[PDB]
Amino acid sequence: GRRIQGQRRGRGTSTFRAPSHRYKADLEHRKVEDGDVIAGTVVDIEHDPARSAPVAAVEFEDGDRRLILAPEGVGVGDELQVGVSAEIAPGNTLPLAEIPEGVPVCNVESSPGDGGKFARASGVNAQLLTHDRNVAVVKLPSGEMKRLDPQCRATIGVVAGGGRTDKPFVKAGNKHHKMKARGTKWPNVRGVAMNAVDHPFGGGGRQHPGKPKSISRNAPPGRKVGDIASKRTGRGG
RNA sequence: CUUCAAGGGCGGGGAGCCAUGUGGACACGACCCGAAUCCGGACGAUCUACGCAUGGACAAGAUGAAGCGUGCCGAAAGGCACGUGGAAGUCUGUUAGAGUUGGUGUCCUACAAUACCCUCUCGUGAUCUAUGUGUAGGGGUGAAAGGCCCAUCGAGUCCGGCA
RNA sequence: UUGAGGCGCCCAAAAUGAUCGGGACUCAAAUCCACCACCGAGACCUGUCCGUACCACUCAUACUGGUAAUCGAGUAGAUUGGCGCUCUAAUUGGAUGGAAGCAGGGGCGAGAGCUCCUGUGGACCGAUUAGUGACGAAAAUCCUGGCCAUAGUAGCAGCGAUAGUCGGGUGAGAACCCCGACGGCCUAAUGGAUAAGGGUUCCUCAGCACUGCUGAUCAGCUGAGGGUUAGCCGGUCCUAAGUCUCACCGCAACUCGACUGAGACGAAAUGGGAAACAGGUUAAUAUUCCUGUGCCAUCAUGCAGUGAAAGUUGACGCCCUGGGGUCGAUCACGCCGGGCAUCGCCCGGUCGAACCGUCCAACUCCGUGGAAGCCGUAAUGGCAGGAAGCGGACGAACGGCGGCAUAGGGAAACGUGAUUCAACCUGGGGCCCAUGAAAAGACGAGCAUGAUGUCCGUACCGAGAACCGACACAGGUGUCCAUGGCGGCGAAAGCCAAGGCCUGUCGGGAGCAACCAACGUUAGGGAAUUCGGCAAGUUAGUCCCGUACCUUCGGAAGAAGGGAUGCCUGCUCCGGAACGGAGCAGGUCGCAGUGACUCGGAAGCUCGGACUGUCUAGUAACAACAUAGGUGACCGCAAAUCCGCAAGGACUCGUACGGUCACUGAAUCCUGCCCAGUGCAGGUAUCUGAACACCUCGUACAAGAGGACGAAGGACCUGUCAACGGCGGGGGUCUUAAGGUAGCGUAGUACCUUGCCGCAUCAGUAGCGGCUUGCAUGAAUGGAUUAACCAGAGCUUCACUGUCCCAACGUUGGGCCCGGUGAACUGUACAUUCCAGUGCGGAGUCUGGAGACACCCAGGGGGAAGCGAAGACCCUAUGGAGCUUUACUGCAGGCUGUCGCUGAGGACUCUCACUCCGGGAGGAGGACACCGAUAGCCGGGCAGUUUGACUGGGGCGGUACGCGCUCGAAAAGAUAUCGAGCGCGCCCUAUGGUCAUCUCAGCCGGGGACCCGGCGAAGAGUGCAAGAGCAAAAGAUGACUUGACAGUGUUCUUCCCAACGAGGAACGCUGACGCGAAAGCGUGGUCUAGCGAACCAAUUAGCCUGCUUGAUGCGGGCAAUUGAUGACAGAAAAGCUACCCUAGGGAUAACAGAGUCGUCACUCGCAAGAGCACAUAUCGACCGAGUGGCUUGCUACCUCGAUGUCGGUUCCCUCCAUCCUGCCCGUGCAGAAGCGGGCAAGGGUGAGGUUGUUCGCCUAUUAAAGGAGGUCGUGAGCUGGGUUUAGACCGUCGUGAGACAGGUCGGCUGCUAUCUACUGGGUGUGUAGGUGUCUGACAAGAACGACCGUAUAGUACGAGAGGAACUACGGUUGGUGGCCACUGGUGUACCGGUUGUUCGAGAGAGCACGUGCCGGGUAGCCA
């Protein structure tokens, strides 16, 4: 047949790419040697085209203008501290060791000094639970207990822009606009509505899949469609 | 040669070798033309699909969302009236522009290898559009019709494989 | 009275014109019995000649003689002699006293062909012999070129742009070249400036051979000259999506490839950007030249200045809105000029830039001030954290103001105020799950004077003739002018300026016919039309009143329905005002006041999809795609998913409120049951599970064999259906897990089926409601429901109408005639046909007849199975391609073990390789991971292929695909069909072999076991089909035995004849045996079925052999046994295609024709039976005999290089088996009305409701509303509703692609007539100069058909009820021909009214599509 849509994706053509040239900043944490004497004042609160959540413009003590991931409640004029012995205030970045247990945290690092990987979407938060000299157990937004290094930096508080998923898109045009700002080809034509040549579920006199939808993990790209390695399907049982 | 044995098979009392013509056979293009393929390397996004960059376009009218206001009633929460406001993949619209339902009209050696006329649809949006730019052939692109990729597509075009 | 024979008669119906070939024939020109004489082949006889064969003579196949009664046709094909062409060679010739070639002509040869003469030509040409070969054409939808008919034919008309006319000019020539006048056309374009693209097309002069839809003196044509001038307009510079180069790395390699660096490129209308305005000038340039004035940058000098870089700018989305404000437009008034002349109105102008200077609203801010309720807006809003008010800092226009300007421009005047105000300036508000460039540059940061400011573009077109589309193409092609006037809501219509044009480039003529394209008007009726209101029409703008069901409360809604609408006089209200809006009173005209133009028809029921949106560029716009919403799945990021061979990369400036992979498809109510199969995932004691390493055997080693351990995977267990999917049969469980819950239901799903009931209609296969056992409904394969929406499917009502009854008249362009220009399709030939026949069964050409004087014009298209396309349907080919899958075989990819990288101390620690994070220090991880290699599993993701044959086409079914028997089979042998009956793919250690003894079925008699006797040629038994063989046996019993043995042949069979393997049989020999006294019998079973190649393996016995050589291992071979190919003389092998493609076939199907006629229709014979009695008024079984060619079927003759489908329609002819009408006979005939029958085809046989229907059902009329043929008449006539392409849905089936003789929505209709045919019109010739009048061979007719009513008559008849006829009248209906006094239509003749706009008003006119609209309408033509 012909290569399926998921195969055209990896080629990285214009249609499947993200409008990077229209994106503001790659939100990473500031690189401090040691100490704490790094503080800044929030100049502006901007809209980030990349994640739909707001982003805070901060100017530091050493005169560095960089955008940072905005938590809830952080406004213009406010002072945020970054360092080891930073004040345990919402919006401050300090390693997981220094942050007390049972406190909601965002922009958590994987390997210490990477700039933040986990809990970065609108209104989400990671929960810090257990402490040790070796490990800091953080409960990520998916409900998974991630065992992390205590030297991994994290910003205190939940991410701003919460409850975005609550209000519906209502009309196709609103989805259109959102998708034109992301790295996604939209709209989605069902495989079952295509020809046999185009997709494993294409063909027939009526629209139904050919074989069962639950595909094996070992399936090759071109065949791996539908329910990928499903442990189960349905709602009941 | 096979064989206790027997019986069988093949060969045996000197004609061949070479040359020229000619009949016929096999491989090769194989008396000549005749078709849909398959494969290789190249040339195409001046058409068209989808994306991107930078620009441009949308008479006039209708309907009157939220919010705000004033008056009245109420302890209050509020409610009602009027006004204000001017929302909308909103309506009418041959505005510009886009599209193409019916006539199965005209044309059908055409004006035209997709045209003409009337009728019809959309027309502030998932809108239309110019230019620049990207994606290339078992690959693109596809709101999916096997649609489109320069009058070429259930696998483009050119030349080669090839007689 | 009865029998037999001969000929004839009845029985006896078919479609364009009857037939024995025709004429025609009757003591024959018939038939039968005899007879006589003739005609009539290429046969037969005969003269001569020829070829061939043979004989004699001969070197001869050279002559000559002879023989053929026993030689003389021939496709494919075998054999043989010869003709002609090119060039070579030897030998030998011809030619300027005329070669070859060509044209016409003479002679020879059976012929291929040879040769001569005359003319032409003007330089080469032969012959014989031996060679050479790019050596011979009527054909291939053959190739190239040329040419004819077609034909002086089509086109030069059709487009909302209908364009011209009269004079004159120039010229050899003028409809179209130029001037004037008159008349028109274009208004977002037909005007102005440009981008791209073109490329000299621009200007001048000279031209007409080319080009130009005719002509041309003209030109975008031909030729020659000429023409594009820049510091300040673009390029140039900057950066955008992004591109390239270099380096680096990959790659076998590169002109290849991703990342990372560096550099460069990347914007001419339309991103950013230092600077120019006014006028004049040329045939052609112009912010470029010239005049005037101005500005920018750099640099030099001089003065100033020490500031200098922070900041600002460049620099930015969509929606609403205020303020400032120019041009324009309009109003007032004044001046200048023009126009008009019943008025005094109308038009044009009244100018003046860049720049320099100056003014500043908005915003922001400061001082003052002191609001507790005030300030403020179009709106939001603002404030003791300090409102209003007052003063102030900062600060805008492409704007005002002054200069510029005793510049420029104007014939002149050379204005002033106003309103609305594009540009431009500056603010306020709102929206985003959308957040709306960058860089160079500028500012920040003065002034003089002088210098420099190079390079590239610059013409013209920019389109119904300069671009793309082969064209001077009705197509396509971006930007700015969006503010010219009236009009009106308007960038709308209509009209008109400025400007442009008469080049959407052939004309002239005919009241101008038919016919066609566009269109106007049609009385009465009003959808009767049609699949369907298709087409057309109706409605319409604005204000007032008023407005249902339902609803998601938004909507429905402009629901529906009703009223109003002009002009004139004078006014009121809102507002600063408008040349803005809203109203009032009085008067007044028309048929009509949104008077033209512009401008919705309305309502209801149902199906689908919720909605806006998307789509098959070019037959599908839809119910299909998308969508929000719903849901499931995967993944913590060193992720999941995806791309790359690699280096690397998308997602990702992303992180679960994420984004990947799928399904369902808004909201609302819901979404049952099943985990057996399949799929996915988890688990797993045990079983199974590869390679490496390890152990055993083996080999001096190795191959090799076995074991041990055992990963993923599998077995097994569990989870899971919003995962593929399933939800029945039976009974009061069974398959295979469950056994259909809510709902919905004759559905776009229901076969039956037009289901039943109801609604509605005269009538309703439709539609809607209800019922509903549902062939075969049903829950995210989503069920139900639903307001709103729709160029979606169906139905009903009101309104409207030429859709129809039923057609008419008119308008414009064609059409017809003339001038000019000038194709194409098509063509084997011949061709004046017609009716029949025949023929490969569908003939202009054959046969027989009939008809037919030639030529030409116009026509509509009957025929040429017309022209167009090597049929898409169907089959076939060891054809192709796309697609599917649990087809065959493989290839990527994923998972997993093992080896290398890889290190220290069956579970563990470490750090040093290696990986990742961190800028770094250092941190995480770590011998793992990555990578290289190998092994096992999964693996249509991808590739190559296969998927047979037979067959009354193919599929399905079957196997007549290898074998045996009987019959078919025609008394030797051979013999077919999907011919009839039926078998074999073994079985047996005895059921084989021999010998001895013996005789069986069945029956009878004596004591179904057993015993004795008799009869008993064979019916018993003999393994199994059938046919055949057998009695001291081939059967039975008994005993002994293993010949069912080894080896090698002969022959027949397999395969008649007649080649062919395996297999088989009969018959021998050699060896060894068994039995018997012996002869002898035993090469399996009495005979005919019970079977298998090569390659490879295993097995048996002996031997041969392996590369210099010996030993060992392991191999190669001679002979033979076993293992299977049943498609059985042997491939390892599944499907779909409607997305399709090719080669062919009428070798083969679908239509139709043709044959047949079982079927169908009709008839006839006999006449049981009943009809109260009565066969025969009427009905009529069984059986028998037929005719037709309307049904169906059969066959495969005709066509697959195409004979267009069903139904319908329109128009013509016919048949009779007669429905009516006429004339008749019978009656169970009183009458009336009927029933049955006969003759008869003249005429008629109609309108409607459902359905595509044919058919049929139904309604009302009727004299009756008959049937059938003409290629199921009729698509070069129409329609396109059904069938039957490509799109889609439902049900069913399928794992799937996809299918269905199921349903459903959508889905294209080519061509200029050569021949023939006919309808009409002419010109010639014949009869043989004229005028007028006739005749009538023949030809056509339906010219007429039918009904009702009155008198007869309430009469005959009949108890009555009821109720006729002859005849005479009047009318109606259908058809026919003609005519227009009358009625009616038309009447773009004409007259009137009136809306808009333009000519100033008036008068009088143009335009509004070929009349703006409305009213009336003569002639004519018409019903």
Ligand SMILES: COC(=O)[C@@]12OC[C@]34[C@H]([C@@H](O)[C@@H]1O)[C@@]1(C)CC(=O)C(O)=C(C)[C@@H]1C[C@H]3OC(=O)[C@H](OC(=O)/C=C(\C)C(C)C)[C@@H]24
């Ligand atoms: C121009 O068309 C033809 O001539 C055809 O003749 C009648 C016909 C055919 C063919 O004869 C022939 O090809 C049938 C008569 C042949 C037949 O056997 C059969 O069963 C049917 C169904 C035919 C009817 C008609 O069918 C056409 O498709 C077929 O039409 C076509 O095949 C095609 C046409 C009109 C064009 C698309 C080429 C007809």
Ligand SMILES: [Cl-]
């Ligand atoms: Cl999303």
Ligand SMILES: [Cl-]
């Ligand atoms: Cl000869």
Ligand SMILES: [Cl-]
């Ligand atoms: Cl330019």
Ligand SMILES: [Cl-]
């Ligand atoms: Cl404001």
Ligand SMILES: [K+]
């Ligand atoms: K045919």
Ligand SMILES: [Mg+2]
């Ligand atoms: Mg980041």
Ligand SMILES: [Mg+2]
């Ligand atoms: Mg996008």
Ligand SMILES: [Mg+2]
């Ligand atoms: Mg979808």
Ligand SMILES: [Mg+2]
């Ligand atoms: Mg499809």
Ligand SMILES: [Mg+2]
């Ligand atoms: Mg596939």
Ligand SMILES: [Mg+2]
């Ligand atoms: Mg579906």
Ligand SMILES: [Mg+2]
């Ligand atoms: Mg489905």
Ligand SMILES: [Mg+2]
């Ligand atoms: Mg382009």
Ligand SMILES: [Mg+2]
């Ligand atoms: Mg309002």
Ligand SMILES: [Mg+2]
């Ligand atoms: Mg399809």
